[PDB]
Amino acid sequence: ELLPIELDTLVGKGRFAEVYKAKLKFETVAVKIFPYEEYASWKTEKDIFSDINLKHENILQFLTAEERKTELGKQYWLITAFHAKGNLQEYLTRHVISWEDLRKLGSSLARGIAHLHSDHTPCGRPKMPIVHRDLKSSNILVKNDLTCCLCDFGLSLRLDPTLSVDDGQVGTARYMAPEVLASAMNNVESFKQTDVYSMALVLWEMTSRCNAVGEVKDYEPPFGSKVREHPCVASMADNVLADAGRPEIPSFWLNHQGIQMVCETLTECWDHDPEARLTAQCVAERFSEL
Numbered sequence: 001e002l003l004p005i006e007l008d009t010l011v012g013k014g015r016f017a018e019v020y021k022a023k024l025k026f027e028t029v030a031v032k033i034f035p036y037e038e039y040a041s042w043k044t045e046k047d048i049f050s051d052i053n054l055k056h057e058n059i060l061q062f063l064t065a066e067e068r069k070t071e072l073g074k075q076y077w078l079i080t081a082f083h084a085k086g087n088l089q090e091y092l093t094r095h096v097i098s099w100e101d102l103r104k105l106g107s108s109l110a111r112g113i114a115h116l117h118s119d120h121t122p123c124g125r126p127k128m129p130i131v132h133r134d135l136k137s138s139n140i141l142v143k144n145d146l147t148c149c150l151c152d153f154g155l156s157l158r159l160d161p162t163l164s165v166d167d168g169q170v171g172t173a174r175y176m177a178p179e180v181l182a183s184a185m186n187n188v189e190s191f192k193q194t195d196v197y198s199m200a201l202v203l204w205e206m207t208s209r210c211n212a213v214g215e216v217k218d219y220e221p222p223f224g225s226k227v228r229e230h231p232c233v234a235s236m237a238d239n240v241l242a243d244a245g246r247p248e249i250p251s252f253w254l255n256h257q258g259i260q261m262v263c264e265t266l267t268e269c270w271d272h273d274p275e276a277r278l279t280a281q282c283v284a285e286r287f288s289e290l
Helices: 034-049 088-094 101-118 189-208 234-243 251-255 255-268 280-288
Strands: 004-013 018-021 029-035 062-069 072-079 141-144 148-150
Touching: 004 029, 029 034, 034 062, 088 141, 088 189, 101 141, 101 148, 101 189, 101 255, 101 280, 189 255, 189 280, 251 255, 255 280
Parallel strands: none
Antiparallel strands: 004 018, 018 029, 029 072, 062 072, 141 148
């Protein structure tokens, strides 16, 4: 029961896996390949993608997981929809986006996160919340219709009441909330608030490349003008925590009313105080009012 795949091109490398554009005999699929040593990440993602209640337009569509014996030993595959327009970071690097693009990307991002965060299904029944714990533009995929979907659940945490104190600062230092950089966390709502902080930075990346503001600069990642290519937690703590630093919002951006509203929403969402941040649900609601 192994699918007829042929690995065309490496499109991704992370800590845990390589991602390949491949063919199924839809002819175009993504194949995420984990070595045996990264079994844990494959399983964490597999369990999220296999969960009946995490099927959503704004979550990457999963076909199947496979175990594939090789000469070196064994590989662990996740086979998913392939989004040809690539991850949001690559997309914002390549393109200046319209107001309409920003509204679709931003709304779809917030609806995807709010769905992960929700303690209930649409049809009202309870579900254990997931927090992504590594939200960033390279972990968001641009669909042909210019909506986002979430992927890369390798570091995700099921908000399980049995989770021990030992169960730190896993994830990408650049996108880490001040309370994570400070090691100043406990709330349950605490991990949801860290996702929202990272989401804010991504809304900023989208806004930074939106032609509604007027003149658009080249894409740079959040804090790109202040920290090295691969910033450590210490450097991030100095910027985000010690200097209360956030990506720059030039005042001329606020002259467009849409951009102004997005900049006010995302600014609340990257507040030093996690309790000051909006919920993903609240952000999705503001985006629909646009």
